[PDB]
Enzyme design. Structure first.
Site, PDB file in Angstrom:
ATOM      1  N   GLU A 136       0.817  -1.224   0.000  1.00 51.61           N
ATOM      2  CA  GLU A 136       0.000   0.000   0.000  1.00 51.61           C
ATOM      3  C   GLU A 136       0.864   1.294   0.000  1.00 51.61           C
ATOM      4  O   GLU A 136       0.365   2.389   0.081  1.00 51.61           O
ATOM      5  CB  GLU A 136      -0.975  -0.058   1.198  1.00 51.61           C
ATOM      6  CG  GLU A 136      -0.452   0.430   2.489  1.00 51.61           C
ATOM      7  CD  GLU A 136       0.281  -0.578   3.294  1.00 51.61           C
ATOM      8  OE1 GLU A 136       0.970  -1.463   2.747  1.00 51.61           O
ATOM      9  OE2 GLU A 136       0.116  -0.478   4.529  1.00 51.61           O
ATOM     10  N   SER A 150      -6.350  14.372  24.795  1.00 52.62           N
ATOM     11  CA  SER A 150      -7.722  14.319  25.260  1.00 52.62           C
ATOM     12  C   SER A 150      -8.016  15.365  26.328  1.00 52.62           C
ATOM     13  O   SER A 150      -9.122  15.709  26.500  1.00 52.62           O
ATOM     14  CB  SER A 150      -8.034  12.934  25.886  1.00 52.62           C
ATOM     15  OG  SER A 150      -7.111  12.655  26.950  1.00 52.62           O
ATOM     16  N   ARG A 195       0.525  14.680  18.410  1.00 54.26           N
ATOM     17  CA  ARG A 195      -0.563  13.778  18.826  1.00 54.26           C
ATOM     18  C   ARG A 195      -1.790  14.556  19.272  1.00 54.26           C
ATOM     19  O   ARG A 195      -1.708  15.767  19.568  1.00 54.26           O
ATOM     20  CB  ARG A 195      -0.099  12.812  19.939  1.00 54.26           C
ATOM     21  CG  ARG A 195       0.168  13.420  21.262  1.00 54.26           C
ATOM     22  CD  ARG A 195       0.337  12.354  22.329  1.00 54.26           C
ATOM     23  NE  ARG A 195       0.820  12.983  23.551  1.00 54.26           N
ATOM     24  CZ  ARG A 195       0.040  13.687  24.390  1.00 54.26           C
ATOM     25  NH1 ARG A 195      -1.270  13.876  24.164  1.00 54.26           N
ATOM     26  NH2 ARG A 195       0.565  14.234  25.474  1.00 54.26           N
ATOM     27  N   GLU A 225       5.250   2.415   3.728  1.00 54.37           N
ATOM     28  CA  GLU A 225       3.933   1.788   3.681  1.00 54.37           C
ATOM     29  C   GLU A 225       2.866   2.776   3.290  1.00 54.37           C
ATOM     30  O   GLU A 225       1.697   2.400   3.187  1.00 54.37           O
ATOM     31  CB  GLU A 225       3.574   1.100   5.036  1.00 54.37           C
ATOM     32  CG  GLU A 225       4.713   0.397   5.827  1.00 54.37           C
ATOM     33  CD  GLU A 225       4.339   0.180   7.329  1.00 54.37           C
ATOM     34  OE1 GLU A 225       4.898   0.824   8.300  1.00 54.37           O
ATOM     35  OE2 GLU A 225       3.431  -0.599   7.584  1.00 54.37           O
ATOM     36  N   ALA A 273       0.128   4.735  11.007  1.00 57.63           N
ATOM     37  CA  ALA A 273      -0.817   4.312  10.016  1.00 57.63           C
ATOM     38  C   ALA A 273      -1.959   5.322   9.897  1.00 57.63           C
ATOM     39  O   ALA A 273      -2.353   5.905  10.872  1.00 57.63           O
ATOM     40  CB  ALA A 273      -1.326   2.923  10.318  1.00 57.63           C
TER      41      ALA A 273
END
Lengths: 284, 284, 284
Positions: A164, A273, A270, A180, A223
């Site tokens: 991919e 939260s 990142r 990837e 990913a």
């Protein structure tokens, strides 16, 4: 810089260049290629040995010169951004890439009918850039689906392109890297980088600089992540997070456009939260 | 467990094993394969019948044994995690997978030149694992782009792998499933699961356990979603959302690492606009 | 509407239809195809000229009629949603698409063994729908990996499908468009749309209408974005953002289900760091 090579061209009866194969660069040996010269009446093309000489700093001036440029990249003679490719789209023909070789798009239905007397015809691709591996297999690389690497891609020794992954022309890896995800034209990543599965580097709407991006050494893109800014070494982008040039990121207590962090080393991007923001924090 | 089979190996003049094909498992019938034995002087390899016997619980010990392991998986004789594959990367050669069969990476330029006297050479892949379907087509499956399923993948009867799906070795489906996303090595999904388009299961940076994941029955992962934790049955992950092992999710009024919910049944993971959090709520 | 054509069918000894090729529509010329008629004993099929006539508004009634429907789409005689395809899944056989042509799934191991006396057998795909380009190459298109366009896809003149794009049957582009992401069955995009790399239109869990979606002119979907609602013209979806039918978006001071904005023109969907919400704002 002057560069030259001997190859074999596939020409239509108009003299349009469908492809040129240069098996090696800087070489004179014509008669490795003489037994390939000829006419293919089913495809209506002839194959003819050529010698091509260019200046890498000049814009390409004809189709032969374009093709040699792409071979120089994929042979790794020159790195991305050291060869002028301006105008290359206007020099390359759209071709039907088949199991019998390149065929002209004009009158392909007749070509398909003629070729079918020899065997099943399969079309791999229809494009201006062929599949790299059918012209050059560079040493020390793995490619899981070789549809996904265009001639003109630069894959450093030690690189794996997973199924991919995708590497466009004038793009690729400067050291051993796991690819990837998708490396757009003009983009390079450096040593020990992992572009995670389905990640996008410099994809559609990721940026608005007048200018292309790169990643440094040992960058890890999760990913399904994305990156629209140049990054330095040892940066991390969380799986599932797209950092565009215009994404607001929380760094030192305030929101900043991600473009202001261009070229940083040792940042982890990142989701957080507790703040509800994309944060950039130091990697240790 | 003892397992054995008769196949045909492709060997270089060094005796390096490029591939072994075992058309069936546990069989003695050599002379289905005798008319394939021979020398290919263009590729410089010979094809030779072999019989291979292994213990599935022992680590593989040579290249023949590695190849039989991958066939046992893709024939569905054994499920993922019931065959020891430790060290398999060091036993498999990097190969150039062409329309003329496997070729050695060393001296491929000469091989390509020799083969070109017979026909157009096309390179499909350059890798240690070939395309599953060229060795085994398991019954009851559809595969839209068969570049994307490695030999060693286990696809249960009733499985469709769509064109953007991918299934690595030692991975796959335990019942009838729609696979439109990417199943990493060691990962399995169970009956009635739909891995949506471009979804990632256990991709790069999705987890930090010492240990691989799986999904249960009837799990639905939205398009472009991701999952880095084991899930039980009847779980849903919203389109566009990546649940990593370290993602903080709101469950019963507080934030918890998603890894604490590993193996749950009947949870819906989704973004929640009123809280600004990823929530895990009961599926009904 | 009545439509008809002459093609060549591949039939098993049961008379199951593996494929029909109709090189052109509305034509009578049988003897372009007569030299292809015959028996292939390795595959156990015969190839036989047929003439097929259908009504586009009636459901298809046999396999020949299904195949002609898919050719009418990919030849661009009719647009998506102007041909009735109800029941088509029950009319198409699962086939093994090989370098030697279509083969039956039943007894493929024997077929593979017989074909291997002629050459390396390669399996491209195992599916009910073949690769479009092996039947029809429509004019004015580029396709980087032609595994990713199913017969029945409608690609308008001027369309590029990049290597990570995908176009299902009964779907595609109504004008010149850049397709780098995934267009599900029934979905169309219009003139000047860019579906960015890895974007999903109408993917798994993107919607819950009883009904399929489309995009208008000049829509830009960012890389790794998604869209589960119909959009009008000049809309933008930020890279990395999936707008599902049930996503709550902030528009005029309150949260609304994205489905309530279906068919809008000139909206930009993006994440907003100051509100913590997906916002829909006017494009100018």
């Amino acid at each position: 810089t002057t560069a030259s090579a001997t190859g074999i061209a596939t020409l239509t009866s108009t003299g349009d260049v469908l492809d040129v194969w240069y098996p090696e660069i800087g070489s004179t040996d014509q008669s490795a290629l003489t037994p390939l010269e000829g006419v293919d009446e089913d495809r209506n093309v002839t194959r003819k040995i050529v010698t091509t000489t260019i200046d890498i700093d000049a814009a390409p001036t004809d189709t032969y010169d374009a093709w040699l440029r792409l071979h120089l990249l994929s042979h790794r003679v020159f790195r991305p951004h050291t060869i002028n490719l301006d105008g290359i789209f206007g020099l390359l023909n759209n071709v039907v890439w088949t199991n019998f070789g390149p065929c002209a798009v004009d009158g392909f239905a007749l070509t398909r009918a003629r070729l079918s007397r020899r065997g099943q015809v399969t079309v791999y691709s229809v494009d201006k850039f062929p599949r790299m591996v059918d012209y050059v297999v560079p040493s020390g690389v793995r490619i899981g689906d070789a549809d996904r690497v265009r001639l003109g891609a630069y894959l450093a020794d030690g690189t794996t392109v997973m199924h991919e992954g995708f590497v466009n022309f004038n793009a690729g890896t400067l050291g051993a890297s796991m690819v990837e995800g998708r490396i757009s034209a003009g983009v390079t990543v450096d040593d020990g980088t992992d572009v995670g599965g389905g990640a996008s580097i410099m994809g559609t709407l990721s940026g608005g600089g007048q200018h292309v991006i790169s990643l440094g050494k040992r960058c890890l893109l999760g990913a399904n992540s994305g990156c629209g800014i140049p990054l330095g070494d040892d940066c991390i982008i969380e799986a599932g997070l797209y950092i565009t040039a215009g994404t607001k990121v929380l760094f030192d207590g305030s929101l900043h456009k991600a473009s202001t962090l261009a070229g940083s080393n040792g940042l982890i991007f990142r989701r957080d939260s507790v703040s509800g923001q994309v944060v950039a924090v130091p990697n240790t």
